[PDB]
Amino acid sequence: SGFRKMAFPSGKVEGCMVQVTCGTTTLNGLWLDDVVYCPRHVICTSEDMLNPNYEDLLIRKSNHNFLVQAGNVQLRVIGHSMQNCVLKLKVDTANPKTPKYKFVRIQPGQTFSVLACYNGSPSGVYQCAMRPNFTIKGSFLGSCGSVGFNIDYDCVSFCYMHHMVLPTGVHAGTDLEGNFYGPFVDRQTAQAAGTDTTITVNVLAWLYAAVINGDRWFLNRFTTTLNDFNLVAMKYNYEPLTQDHVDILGPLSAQTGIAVLDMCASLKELLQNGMNGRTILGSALLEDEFTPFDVVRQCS
Amino acid sequence: SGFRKMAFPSGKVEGCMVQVTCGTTTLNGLWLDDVVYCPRHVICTSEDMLNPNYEDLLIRKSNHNFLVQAGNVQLRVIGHSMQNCVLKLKVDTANPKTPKYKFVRIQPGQTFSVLACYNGSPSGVYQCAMRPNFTIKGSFLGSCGSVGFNIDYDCVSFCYMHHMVLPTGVHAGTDLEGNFYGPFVDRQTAQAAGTDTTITVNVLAWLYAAVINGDRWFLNRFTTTLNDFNLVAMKYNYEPLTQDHVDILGPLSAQTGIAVLDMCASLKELLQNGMNGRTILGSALLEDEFTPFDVVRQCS
């Protein structure tokens, strides 16, 4: 019963969050095995950030310039190297709380949980989605280095590490191999994120979640084709719906008895008519940060 | 930057969730020290639930009738007693992952994090609020026994344990001492929850959060009195605002430079006029599940 935005249990990730200080800058790091991962811009001064040469800046840095703290333990750095935009600090102690993990690079429209931290200490956890323009709308104050993750069986799939807030207020980051999501760079300049679109397959999954929970007023009598729907969808800044998206929604269609293209026709009428002051699952707008897998996971 | 509904890190609570089975019924339990806490209706059959006599039903139960599982460990029950509506199962092993904890009974309008579990295994975590009518709108499927909690410094304050879904779809539970929140009983009958109201002090805190994050269009030029505001508030099913509520909002007023009664005047106009198709922090309705402490915690 009920449907809320749910984050994964954060226990396995809390045991990996450490503090990393370089000069006056203090941000968060991820301590897996004997390596601490953190954004490489921790080595930059505020003046360096305008046009940094990270290769030259890192060469000037010494191992003792990085102060790593794990709760009350001071971790000695015995080596440091640069992995794209992620600084890797080799430490003399392996994390005894290291979970089974992997590094994944997710797709636009996929969701994950963020363990927001400050000074290496966990503050809270929340669920968000990678926007189609590779930004994320989160809660980031000293929050740099906080990671995004999913949990599959007993394995923690790390997929995101926060790096910066754009002047537009949106957030940008990298995967755990240091590659930025989107066209962004770790440099203090004006950076334009692309036109953001609505994750169509996520809206349809959220509409199925409403039907599963008894909220059905928006269902109509029609069907449509993928092509006819996408013509209406492109006018309202919705991502085009693919046959892969229809196949992904299959299980929800089976549980509800509502064909995917039938639900697409209901969404098509919702876009052209609006809600007329009505709500769906307690929301007055269409929610697009629940993937079809998220709905299946919570409803099962 | 940004403002999302955030839950506490769930690590300390995950190490306490166990499975409790009695007959065909399997729900969740809380393993603190050498005691496992779970709803007492686990001992009821579906026919017993219509009109249960828990004292007589518990007397017929034996220690070996309770199957407690902690991951892969079978916990032997060496004793059982009834604490109001909470069954306390004394086990032969103390939980080595027992955190520093306390049992608190919260007030209507306060928030907490729920670690939703199924068969003693954590599924997800989310933030919710105790409605003024002592119900909660959550995500509960086998979810009975999942607990709500806050974190203060290093201490886990357990405040809620889920017991049942009302036929109205709302959820009801108890504190960790077994006392129900509200007029509800652990008995399968039609139970009316009171008329629910909007947590006024939470809306005002959420409006301050919008001002802190640059969303200011709703601010007007007026002020009001507590009495004049409450006359308008009672017409729209908002809880009356007290002087204690005004004192609680003090810090947010100091950070924003907007007096509490000035913000009350802005909310008064929002209730009478609506939003006129506008959004506040990305929402088309007024959010009331952020306490003033929640806003202070996330924004600081």
From Swiss-Prot, chains A, B:
The active site is at residues 41, 144. It catalyses: TSAVLQ-|-SGFRK-NH2 and SGVTFQ-|-GKFKK the two peptides corresponding to the two self-cleavage sites of the SARS 3C-like proteinase are the two most reactive peptide substrates. The enzyme exhibits a strong preference for substrates containing Gln at P1 position and Leu at P2 position. There is a cross-link at residues 5, 90 (Glycyl lysine isopeptide (Lys-Gly) (interchain with G-Cter in ubiquitin)). Inhibited by pyridone-containing alpha-ketoamides compounds 13a and 13b. In turn, alpha-ketoamide 13b (tert-butyl (1-((S)-1-(((S)-4-(benzylamino)-3,4-dioxo-1-((S)-2-oxopyrrolidin-3-yl)butan-2-yl)amino)-3-cyclopropyl-1-oxopropan-2-yl)-2-oxo-1,2-dihydropyridin-3-yl)carbamate) inhibits SARS-CoV-2 replication in human lung cells. Inhibited ex vivo by michael acceptor inhibitor N3. Inhibited ex vivo by compound 11a and 11b. Residues 1-300 form the Peptidase C30 domain. Changing residue 204 to V: In strain: Zeta/P.2. Residues 1-300 are cytoplasmic. It is found in: Host cytoplasm; Host Golgi apparatus; Host nucleus. Changing residue 49 to A: Does not affect ability to cleave and inactivate human TRMT1. Changing residue 144 to A: Complete loss of 3C-like proteinase nsp5 cleavage. Changing residue 90 to R: In strain: Beta/B.1.351. Changing residue 132 to H: In strain: Omicron/BA.1, Omicron/BA.2, Omicron/BA.2.12.1, Omicron/BA.2.75, Omicron/BA.4, Omicron/BA.5, Omicron/BQ.1.1, Omicron/XBB.1.5, Omicron/EG.5.1. 3CL-PRO exists as monomer and homodimer. Only the homodimer shows catalytic activity. Interacts with host FBXO22; this interaction promotes the proteasomal degradation of nsp5. Cleaves the C-terminus of replicase polyprotein at 11 sites. Recognizes substrates containing the core sequence [ILMVF]-Q-|-[SGACN]. Cleaves and inactivates human TRMT1, preventing tRNA guanine(26)-dimethylation of tRNAs. May cleave human NLRP1 in lung epithelial cells, thereby activating the NLRP1 inflammasome pathway. May cleave human GSDMD, triggering alternative GSDME-mediated epithelial cell death upon activation of the NLRP1 inflammasome, which may enhance the release interleukins 1B, 6, 16 and 18. Also able to bind an ADP-ribose-1''-phosphate (ADRP). This is 3C-like proteinase nsp5. It comes from Severe acute respiratory syndrome coronavirus 2. The chain holds residues 3264 to 3564 of 7096 of the full protein.
